Coordinates of all heavy atoms in Angstrom, one line a residue:
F1 N 9.3 -18.0 -1.4 CA 9.1 -17.4 0.0 C 8.2 -18.3 0.8 O 7.1 -18.8 0.3 CB 8.4 -16.1 -0.2 CG 8.7 -15.1 0.9 CD1 9.6 -14.0 0.7 CD2 8.1 -15.3 2.2 CE1 9.9 -13.2 1.8 CE2 8.4 -14.5 3.2 CZ 9.2 -13.4 3.0
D2 N 8.6 -18.5 2.0 CA 7.8 -19.4 2.9 C 8.0 -18.8 4.4 O 9.0 -18.8 5.0 CB 8.3 -20.8 2.8 CG 7.5 -21.6 1.8 OD1 6.4 -21.2 1.5 OD2 8.1 -22.6 1.3
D3 N 6.9 -18.5 5.0 CA 6.8 -18.0 6.3 C 7.9 -18.7 7.2 O 8.5 -18.1 8.0 CB 5.4 -18.2 7.0 CG 5.1 -19.7 7.3 OD1 5.0 -20.5 6.3 OD2 5.1 -20.1 8.5
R4 N 8.1 -20.0 7.0 CA 9.1 -20.8 7.7 C 10.5 -20.6 7.1 O 11.4 -20.3 7.8 CB 8.7 -22.3 7.6 CG 7.5 -22.7 8.4 CD 7.6 -24.1 9.0 NE 8.6 -24.2 10.0 CZ 8.6 -25.2 10.9 NH1 7.7 -26.2 10.8 NH2 9.6 -25.3 11.8
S5 N 10.6 -20.6 5.8 CA 11.9 -20.4 5.1 C 12.5 -19.1 5.5 O 13.6 -19.0 5.8 CB 11.7 -20.5 3.6 OG 11.0 -19.4 3.1
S6 N 11.7 -18.0 5.5 CA 12.1 -16.7 5.8 C 11.0 -15.9 6.6 O 9.9 -16.3 6.6 CB 12.6 -16.0 4.6 OG 14.0 -16.2 4.4
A7 N 11.3 -14.8 7.0 CA 10.4 -13.9 7.7 C 10.3 -12.6 6.9 O 11.0 -12.3 6.0 CB 10.8 -13.6 9.1
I8 N 9.4 -11.7 7.4 CA 9.1 -10.4 6.8 C 9.8 -9.3 7.7 O 9.7 -9.3 8.9 CB 7.6 -10.1 6.6 CG1 7.0 -11.2 5.8 CG2 7.5 -8.8 6.0 CD1 7.3 -11.2 4.3
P9 N 10.5 -8.4 7.0 CA 11.1 -7.2 7.7 C 10.1 -6.2 8.3 O 8.9 -6.5 8.4 CB 11.9 -6.6 6.5 CG 11.2 -6.9 5.3 CD 10.6 -8.3 5.5
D10 N 10.6 -5.1 8.6 CA 9.7 -4.0 9.2 C 9.3 -3.0 8.2 O 9.9 -2.9 7.1 CB 10.5 -3.3 10.3 CG 11.8 -2.7 9.9 OD1 11.8 -2.0 8.9 OD2 12.8 -3.0 10.5
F11 N 8.2 -2.3 8.5 CA 7.6 -1.4 7.5 C 7.8 0.1 8.1 O 6.8 0.9 8.0 CB 6.2 -1.6 7.3 CG 5.9 -3.1 7.0 CD1 4.8 -3.7 7.6 CD2 6.8 -3.9 6.3 CE1 4.5 -5.0 7.4 CE2 6.5 -5.2 6.1 CZ 5.4 -5.8 6.6
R12 N 9.0 0.4 8.6 CA 9.2 1.7 9.2 C 10.5 2.3 8.7 O 10.6 3.5 8.4 CB 9.3 1.6 10.7 CG 8.1 1.0 11.4 CD 8.3 0.7 12.9 NE 8.9 -0.7 13.0 CZ 8.2 -1.8 12.9 NH1 6.9 -1.8 12.5 NH2 8.8 -3.0 13.1
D13 N 11.5 1.4 8.4 CA 12.8 1.8 7.9 C 12.9 1.5 6.4 O 12.6 0.4 6.0 CB 13.9 1.2 8.7 CG 14.3 2.0 9.9 OD1 14.6 3.2 9.8 OD2 14.3 1.4 11.1
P14 N 13.4 2.4 5.6 CA 13.5 2.2 4.2 C 14.7 1.3 3.9 O 14.6 0.5 3.0 CB 13.9 3.6 3.7 CG 14.5 4.3 4.9 CD 13.8 3.8 6.1
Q15 N 15.8 1.3 4.7 CA 16.9 0.4 4.5 C 16.5 -1.0 4.5 O 16.9 -1.9 3.7 CB 18.0 0.7 5.5 CG 19.4 0.3 5.1 CD 20.4 0.4 6.2 OE1 20.1 0.9 7.3 NE2 21.6 -0.2 6.0
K16 N 15.6 -1.3 5.4 CA 15.1 -2.7 5.6 C 14.2 -3.1 4.4 O 14.5 -4.2 3.8 CB 14.4 -2.8 6.9 CG 15.2 -2.9 8.2 CD 15.5 -4.3 8.6 CE 16.4 -5.1 7.5 NZ 15.6 -5.7 6.5
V17 N 13.3 -2.3 4.1 CA 12.3 -2.6 3.0 C 13.1 -2.6 1.7 O 12.7 -3.3 0.7 CB 11.3 -1.5 2.9 CG1 10.3 -1.8 1.8 CG2 10.4 -1.5 4.2
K18 N 14.2 -1.8 1.6 CA 15.0 -1.8 0.3 C 15.8 -3.0 0.2 O 15.7 -3.7 -0.8 CB 15.9 -0.5 0.4 CG 17.0 -0.5 -0.7 CD 17.7 0.8 -0.8 CE 18.9 0.7 -1.6 NZ 18.7 0.9 -3.1
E19 N 16.6 -3.3 1.1 CA 17.5 -4.5 1.2 C 16.7 -5.7 0.8 O 17.2 -6.6 0.1 CB 18.2 -4.6 2.5 CG 17.2 -4.9 3.6 CD 18.0 -5.4 4.9 OE1 18.6 -4.5 5.5 OE2 17.9 -6.6 5.2
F20 N 15.5 -5.7 1.3 CA 14.5 -6.9 1.0 C 14.0 -6.8 -0.4 O 14.0 -7.8 -1.1 CB 13.4 -6.9 2.0 CG 12.4 -7.9 1.7 CD1 12.2 -9.0 2.6 CD2 11.5 -7.7 0.7 CE1 11.2 -10.0 2.3 CE2 10.5 -8.6 0.4 CZ 10.4 -9.8 1.2
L21 N 13.4 -5.7 -0.7 CA 12.9 -5.5 -2.1 C 13.8 -5.9 -3.2 O 13.4 -6.4 -4.2 CB 12.4 -4.1 -2.3 CG 11.0 -3.7 -1.9 CD1 10.7 -2.2 -2.0 CD2 9.9 -4.5 -2.7
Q22 N 15.2 -5.6 -2.9 CA 16.2 -5.9 -3.9 C 16.3 -7.4 -4.1 O 16.3 -7.9 -5.3 CB 17.5 -5.4 -3.4 CG 17.6 -3.9 -3.4 CD 18.9 -3.4 -2.8 OE1 19.6 -4.0 -2.0 NE2 19.4 -2.2 -3.4
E23 N 16.4 -8.2 -3.0 CA 16.5 -9.6 -3.1 C 15.2 -10.2 -3.9 O 15.2 -11.4 -4.3 CB 16.5 -10.2 -1.7 CG 17.7 -9.7 -0.9 CD 18.2 -10.6 0.1 OE1 17.5 -10.9 1.2 OE2 19.3 -11.2 -0.1
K24 N 14.2 -9.4 -4.0 CA 13.0 -9.8 -4.8 C 13.1 -9.4 -6.2 O 12.5 -10.1 -7.1 CB 11.8 -9.2 -4.1 CG 10.5 -10.0 -4.2 CD 9.3 -9.2 -4.2 CE 8.1 -10.0 -3.5 NZ 8.0 -9.9 -2.1
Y25 N 13.8 -8.3 -6.5 CA 13.8 -7.8 -7.8 C 15.3 -7.8 -8.3 O 15.7 -8.4 -9.3 CB 13.3 -6.4 -8.0 CG 11.9 -6.3 -7.4 CD1 11.6 -5.2 -6.6 CD2 10.9 -7.2 -7.6 CE1 10.4 -5.0 -6.0 CE2 9.7 -7.1 -7.0 CZ 9.4 -6.0 -6.2 OH 8.1 -5.9 -5.6
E26 N 16.2 -7.1 -7.6 CA 17.6 -7.0 -7.9 C 18.2 -8.4 -7.9 O 19.0 -8.7 -8.8 CB 18.3 -6.2 -6.8 CG 18.4 -4.7 -7.2 CD 17.1 -4.2 -7.8 OE1 16.0 -4.3 -7.1 OE2 17.1 -3.7 -8.9
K27 N 17.8 -9.3 -7.0 CA 18.4 -10.7 -7.0 C 17.3 -11.6 -7.5 O 17.7 -12.7 -8.0 CB 18.8 -11.1 -5.6 CG 19.5 -9.9 -4.8 CD 20.9 -9.9 -5.1 CE 21.8 -9.1 -4.1 NZ 21.7 -9.7 -2.8
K28 N 16.1 -11.3 -7.3 CA 14.9 -12.2 -7.8 C 15.1 -13.6 -7.2 O 15.0 -14.6 -7.9 CB 15.0 -12.2 -9.3 CG 14.1 -11.2 -10.0 CD 14.2 -11.3 -11.5 CE 13.4 -10.2 -12.2 NZ 14.2 -8.8 -12.1
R29 N 15.3 -13.6 -5.9 CA 15.4 -14.9 -5.2 C 14.0 -15.8 -5.3 O 14.1 -16.8 -6.0 CB 15.6 -14.6 -3.7 CG 16.2 -15.8 -3.0 CD 16.9 -15.5 -1.7 NE 17.8 -16.5 -1.2 CZ 17.4 -17.5 -0.6 NH1 16.0 -17.8 -0.4 NH2 18.2 -18.5 -0.1
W30 N 13.0 -15.3 -4.8 CA 11.7 -16.0 -4.8 C 11.0 -15.6 -6.2 O 9.8 -15.5 -6.2 CB 10.8 -15.6 -3.7 CG 11.6 -15.6 -2.3 CD1 11.8 -16.7 -1.5 CD2 12.3 -14.4 -1.8 NE1 12.6 -16.2 -0.5 CE2 12.8 -14.9 -0.6 CE3 12.3 -13.1 -2.2 CZ2 13.5 -14.0 0.3 CZ3 13.1 -12.3 -1.3 CH2 13.6 -12.7 -0.1
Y31 N 11.7 -15.5 -7.2 CA 11.2 -15.1 -8.6 C 10.7 -16.4 -9.3 O 11.6 -17.1 -9.9 CB 12.2 -14.3 -9.4 CG 11.7 -14.1 -10.8 CD1 10.4 -13.7 -11.1 CD2 12.6 -14.3 -11.8 CE1 10.0 -13.5 -12.4 CE2 12.2 -14.1 -13.2 CZ 10.9 -13.7 -13.4 OH 10.5 -13.5 -14.7
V32 N 9.4 -16.6 -9.3 CA 8.9 -17.8 -10.0 C 7.7 -17.4 -10.9 O 6.5 -17.3 -10.4 CB 8.4 -18.9 -9.0 CG1 7.8 -20.1 -9.7 CG2 9.6 -19.3 -8.1
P33 N 7.9 -17.3 -12.2 CA 6.9 -16.8 -13.1 C 5.9 -18.0 -13.4 O 6.2 -19.2 -13.2 CB 7.6 -16.5 -14.4 CG 8.9 -17.4 -14.3 CD 9.2 -17.4 -12.8
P34 N 4.7 -17.6 -13.8 CA 3.6 -18.6 -14.1 C 3.8 -19.4 -15.3 O 3.6 -20.6 -15.4 CB 2.3 -17.7 -14.3 CG 2.9 -16.4 -14.8 CD 4.2 -16.2 -14.1
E35 N 4.4 -18.8 -16.3 CA 4.8 -19.5 -17.6 C 5.4 -20.9 -17.3 O 5.1 -21.9 -18.0 CB 5.8 -18.7 -18.4 CG 5.2 -17.6 -19.2 CD 4.8 -16.4 -18.2 OE1 5.5 -16.2 -17.3 OE2 3.8 -15.7 -18.5

């Protein structure tokens, strides 16, 4: 995740927060473990 690479959605609609949250867990795009 990079402010430049991408932006942050809105915190009013669930559909927006959901579709985004998924790409973080469901898709695990910016998923980078410490290990």
